[model samples]
Target chain A: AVPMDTISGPWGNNGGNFWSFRPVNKINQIVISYGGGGNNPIALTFSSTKADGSKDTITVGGGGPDSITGTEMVNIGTDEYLTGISGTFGIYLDNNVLRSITFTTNLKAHGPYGQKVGTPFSSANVNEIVGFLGRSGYYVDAIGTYNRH
Target chain B: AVPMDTISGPWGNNGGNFWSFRPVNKINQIVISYGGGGNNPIALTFSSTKGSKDTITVGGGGPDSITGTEMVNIGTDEYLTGISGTFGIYLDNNVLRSITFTTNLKAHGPYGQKVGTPFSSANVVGNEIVGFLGRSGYYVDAIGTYNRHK
Candidate 1:
């Protein structure tokens, strides 16, 4: 469970099934809750700002068939600097039926090219933060942020 | 409303977000109830027969209240288009989310696009029927079908 102060918005609405937020500083954790009742799948992407001022983006489930619900926690290790987050949600309905998929996801910076950030995450210490949530058939419940304190 | 004798199977337990139903004849109307706690949206796709048959798909919000007493109606003029055969409804979205649907349809020839046997607006009938409830995150309180006549 995340402390209430570390989370963001359970944004009720998104512009074109998408939403974003700006963190105060370097953040290594994120939690999203899918409160809407549609069957659409949601995708999230994380970006980081390197100490050299360059930006790197990592994609998760934007195009994949994954559901976004309950609570999800993402841990981006200690090698990279945090910047922003973004994503998309699927809202296609077949035969008058919603084709939304549901599930939870957790992202990390693992791999040769993976990015990591320092521990004890703090939103105020991170760079600009942004995210997108596909808003076709459902509403967002809430989104949370955390650090490795 | 379709008579209780016409509809079958809210089925039970779809591994993911899938549901199937077999109508006695060609069904025209489908009534779905989202008896879930949250006002989550539910998407439904109806396929008549299989392979090359007609199909219709739609999405909507489930019941907002606790009793999960929200209902959705599909097929008036738009839904009835190119629909027939042993149809299936695929509910795509959240996992472990339980829901069910009920429908009342009509019986007609293989290619008859019209609602009635002879095709007359006044000939359209209504019915009342009961459907099964598939369990998951949400509950399908009841699916009722209706028409102008029995």
Candidate 2:
């Protein structure tokens, strides 16, 4: 079912099908191969389907596995859209030792409760622009905007 | 008439009598006479009647009257009393000048208000008591008592 909150994006319809409005049930996976150095680098992939119903893909690298069942939520929008994940993921050391743990998610839906996706970046501050890549801090000055996601 | 907020004293009567309970009203004639070198000594007199038929009497000189027209409220066994007088008097260049410009009465009353009399005495510690009046500051045995009159 389309979440009541995500109905605004894609087609500006609270009741219609939008790309960002789609259900999160679409599966994604990430892998941390043993780099044999500090920890292993990571390969994250999103299991999204294309307009023709084929598979669409997005991926990233270089991250350590959590000590606990560590997890990370990457928001699709520059502006924070509320409904983020809430669970722990374990980070593993090279020797298979649980080194650390983490869980990440967003706080609220900016731009009218998921009105537009990826943060209304076209209208957002430059810090938010950097936030598209994941640098989020407290303030949005140029110094604070320089490299934060 | 008894005031709602007032309480009776020793006599057990909630409201006291006029003479003994109420304050005594009088007009005061103040005189400042110079007898010392730097500052002139002073004398104060109040024309207070014992009753409607009695003559006026003046209190002796003792209390410090540096300023004029000072109202002193004295405490009594029965009730609180008061007296109004032009008393904060100053002596400049041997010329006496009273600081009180204007007041309601020359001296009001010796009402039920009690007079607070303080006693200060210096006790000899290591040797003789120091200063001019044998009352110096640094760590001397001193005794003081505060008394309230009706």
Candidate 3:
């Protein structure tokens, strides 16, 4: 049920449809796509473990069907896991949007893709990130998280 | 009494005395010192709400004499959500060059300096930072946290 779950963000100005991804286990891979300017993320994909001891993936904000840079990616080794997320959000087309973001795992940290030119935000704790919660549409609107043991 | 909890680092190289602060309530303030010819955290102190202000300190003497200091204050209702930082060698000794704490409301750092390799803890979902556990000597050599259910 993700009971007692705390929202880490919703960062950018409120917009887009609400989305949630609460996998049953630790996430292992992350993929981020950017818009034309390459200064903001337009979509994200997360891969992780499932209840029956299998692997699966979930994606959101599939770009406007004309995204750029293909997708910046990172793989979390078997023993490594996501620890935190940090980034900046700014206005684009008069709507608040994620300007750039970085993903940190126990082993390494990846990109602040796009541009870091606005308000900053981060999400983290001591437990692994099991899922994500955010608002998204044609462009990545707002982002947040769900972390636990 | 702090349950459903987990420990986070003790990251950085271990070098000093072992220390911890597990408050019955929550921590209210934290004072960190660094910069001794090298800008690495050398000591730390925590003030908790348990005694209305009970405190614990470590690595604040001799080799870890205070040089540069920084503080993060936590309010009565706020929880220390998580922490991120960097650790590496300075003058041949491993040290924490920087650290940042995030509460349910704001971000408090990059304290010290963001030198060397970086490390970030998990996330602040179903828990709260109840206390700390780490080794602190020539510098706040390593830092970790005790997170329990809210």
Grade the docking of candidate 1.
Answer: incorrect
Lowest summed lDDT over 10 consecutive residues: which window, candidate 2 chain A? A135-144
Per candidate, native contacts kept equal 0.00, 0.00, 0.00
DockQ score, prediction 1: 0.01
Q: Cα lDDT of all candidates, in order?
A: 0.28, 0.20, 0.66
Local lDDT at B111 for model 1 = 20
Which docking class does model 3 fall in?
incorrect
Ranking, TM-score, top scorer first: 3, 1, 2
Give DockQ for candidates 1 onward, in order. Answer: 0.01, 0.00, 0.01
User: How does residue B51 of candidate 2 score in lDDT?
Assistant: 38
What's the TM for model 3? 0.47
Per-residue lDDT of model 2, residues B1-150, tens digit only: 101112121111111111111111222222222223323323221221223211111111223333422333322211212212221223222111121212222323322122222222222122111000000011101111111221
Find the candidate with the highest TM-score and give its number.
3
Q: Report residue A67 deviation for candidate 3 (angstroms).
A: 68
Candidate 3 structure quality by residue, lDDT tens digits, B1-150: 101235677676647645444444457888877766555676676665443333555555454346677888887668787888898876587777788888988879878777889988787677777666666655666677777666
